[PDB]
Amino acid sequence: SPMDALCRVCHTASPRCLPLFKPLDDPISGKPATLASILSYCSGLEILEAELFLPHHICPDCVAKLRLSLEFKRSVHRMDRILRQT
Amino acid sequence: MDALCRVCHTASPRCLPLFKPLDDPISGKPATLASILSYCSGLEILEAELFLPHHICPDCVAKLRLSLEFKRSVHRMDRILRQT
């Protein structure tokens, strides 16, 4: 239970929750992607490290739904660009 | 030629119409596949743009349903977290 962190999406306590604010890439222009910037992209919510009293992690099942959401949103945008000659 | 999917551009004789009213599958409230797609993607899916596809294939509708369930779950938890 001290072994556990709470998921920002479903509030489950899991010892395998992943940190929302850890960089997943090291890009040369601009800030790294994080699970929080992907969650914000998919959900439209502000997911900000500065709100220190909210959950800062995401459980493996919610990360799985997030990955599908991201692929879907990116596919909708990619097609929209192609269709608009963008 | 079969109808083209707005999301993946497959031509399918089983594509579904974006602009026909149905009940939102989470809220039960009036919606269309276009208003749900717009809500999940952040793009305007408007019938008046007559040069763009007006249909969506059953595979992309399945991904859309998962996307909507996920977005609504994130928002429901946010309300609980910020709840009076």
Ligand SMILES: [Zn+2]
């Ligand atoms: Zn979760």
Ligand SMILES: [Zn+2]
């Ligand atoms: Zn499709």
